[PDB]
Amino acid sequence: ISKEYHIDEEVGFALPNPQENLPDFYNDWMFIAKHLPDLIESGQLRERVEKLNMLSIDHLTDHKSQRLARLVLGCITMAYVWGKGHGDVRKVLPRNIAVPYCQLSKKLELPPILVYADCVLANWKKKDPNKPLTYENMDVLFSFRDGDCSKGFFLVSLLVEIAAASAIKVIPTVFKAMQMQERDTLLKALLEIASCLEKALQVFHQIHDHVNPKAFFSVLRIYLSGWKGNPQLSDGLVYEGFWEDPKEFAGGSAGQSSVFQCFDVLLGIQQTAGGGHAAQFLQDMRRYMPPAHRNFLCSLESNPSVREFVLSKGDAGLREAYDACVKALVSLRSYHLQIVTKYILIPASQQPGTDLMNFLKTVRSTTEKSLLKE
Ligand SMILES: Cc1nccc(N2CCCc3nc(C4(NC(=O)c5ccc(F)cc5)CC4)ccc32)n1
């Protein structure tokens, strides 16, 4: 894969070895983000954010510092807007935080809101550099509240992203085998993708240990919520000293992951085509990815179809290898519906996520119908 797309070998779509600390100029931002559970509970976060001076973004030179500054400012924006998470909400984001955040967001080509690329892909570190990428050795940089299971929720999402990296690196081999006209290399490449997607499902199983249902629904789901089609923030969030009118932006979700879309585009599973609701959302969430990663997904569509290549040739081995990738995806989609039933629906039923289930049923229905043999 080309280096311009920003896909690491082992790490994949995730940012390899992100920065923990910023430079000395951004200590006032870094204090509020590090102690975000403490300042919300005491009722002094909105006091601390309003006290800030408008720090310029010129000292953030390299890419990893800018991604850290997006994560720091993004988490502060969710904490300032939502607050304790008991109805009391802020429509106005102050100039001291909003001006540098929108300027930094415009520079990186992202919306000024916490996305999957901030809170999963950039929000991690390695405890021991010698020891490998696993949950015991890994830890998140920032959290919202105490007992929110943000460590469990974001790292298990990241580990599935890291598991998918082994499938991603062999994508060049698939398109090279089609143009060069090599059946056995194409069959070998597809079985390797199917194997890696099967292993990614076993990594997905770790979410039950590290996250609980009551913690995600009541606490962590509130902070990940955006301001697009929300009864609380109807018109949107006004960013002070940057835009005049309030601009709407959707919150964090699985659809913002490039892993969520790339294998559908590779295998010709028509998610984005056929202008339904689930199609439009997945297309909209490409702008919530980083610019290099949306270009990667878009460049997969430019290459010729793997489905039509496998369909045109009357080859049972290629069809079985193609179906192994699709069946591996259906298993991941099926398992994601079991998580949304456990972590959103059952917590919601015990109080005085229908649209999220209806989305993931439609995404799975598209994946299952794309099978050649049942
Ligand atoms: C191909 C495929 N199939 C099924 C699922 C799938 N992904 C993308 C790779 C990891 C992944 N993680 C989550 C989980 N996390 C989130 O949905 C999530 C939500 C909000 C947020 F701000 C950040 C992450 C763990 C619940 C769901 C789907 C998938 N990818």
Pocket test for ligand 1, best of 142, 143, 160 (most atoms within 8 A of CB): 160
For residue 159, give every residue at least 6 positions away whose Cβ sits within 8 Å of its Cβ, in sequence order, or none.
133, 134, 135, 138, 203, 206
Locate all alpha helices (DSSP H) within the chain, ordered by sequence.
Answer: 27-34, 36-42, 45-51, 63-82, 95-108, 116, 150-169, 171-180, 183-204, 207-210, 213-215, 221-224, 259-266, 277-284, 291-302, 306-312, 316-340, 346-349, 354-369
Question: Cα(160) to centroid of ligand 1, in Å?
Answer: 8
Name beta bridge partners: 227: 249
Q: Determine the residue of 123, 153, 336 to mutate for testing ligand 1's pocket, defined as the one with the most ligand atoms within 8 A of the Cβ atom.
A: 336
Which amino acid is it at 106?
K
DSSP symbol at 25: G
Measure the CA–CA gap between 149 and 145, rounded to whole angstroms.
9
Q: Whose CA is nearest to atom 22 of ligand 1?
A: 252
Interval between CA 285 and ligand 1 midpoint (Å): 13
In 9-149, where does DSSP find H-type helix?
27-34, 36-42, 45-51, 63-82, 95-108, 116
The answer to whether the beta carbons of residues 271 and 261 sit under 8 Å apart is yes
Q: Cβ distance 13 to 164 under 8 Å?
A: yes
Task: Output the CA 161–ligand 1 centroid distance in Å.
Answer: 9
Q: Which residues contact 350 (CB under 8 A, 6 or more apart)?
A: none
Instruction: Measure 307 CA to ligand 1 centroid, in angstroms.
Output: 25
Task: Output the CA–CA distances (angstroms, integers) from residue 59 to 24, 25, 26, 92, 197, in the order listed.
Answer: 10, 8, 9, 26, 41
**Method used to determine the 3D structure:** X-ray
Nearest to 332 by CA among 198, 191, 192, 156: 198
Tokens of 193: 């993708």
| 136 phi/psi in degrees, rounded to 5 | -65, -40
Which residue shows structure tokens 């039950």?
A: 208
Pairing of strands 92-93, 238-239: parallel
Can you tell me the distance from the alpha carbon of 317 to that of 187, in angstroms, rounded to the nearest whole number? Answer: 7
336 is in an annotated binding site: yes
Q: Calculate how far, in angstroms, residue 140's C-alpha sits from the geometric centre of ligand 1.
A: 16
Residue type, 323: D
Which distant-in-sequence residues (6+ apart) come within 8 Å of 228 by Cβ? 236, 248, 249, 250, 251
Provide Rg for the chain, Cα atoms: 21
**Listed residue (190, 170, 198, 199) closest to 317, CA to CA:** 190
The pair of three-digit structure tokens given for residue 344, joined into one six-digit string: 């959103």
Residue where the block lists tokens 């609701």: 277
Could you identify the atom of ligand 1 that is nearest to the CA of residue 254? 17
Distance between CA atoms of residues 240 and 95, nearest Å = 5
Residue nearest to atom 20 of ligand 1 (CA): 253
Domain boundaries, the chain: 1-18+147-224+250-374, 19-146+225-249
The reported resolution of this PDB entry, expressed in Å, is: 2.7
Site residues for ligand 1, CB cut-off 6 Å:
116, 119-120, 156-157, 160-161, 207, 224, 252-254, 257, 259-260, 263, 329, 332-333, 336, 339
Closest to 216 (Cα-Cα) out of 93, 342, 97:
342
- Ligand 1 pocket mutation pick from 110, 157, 203, 212 by most atoms within 8 angstroms of CB: 157
CA–CA separation, 342 and 354 (whole Å): 13
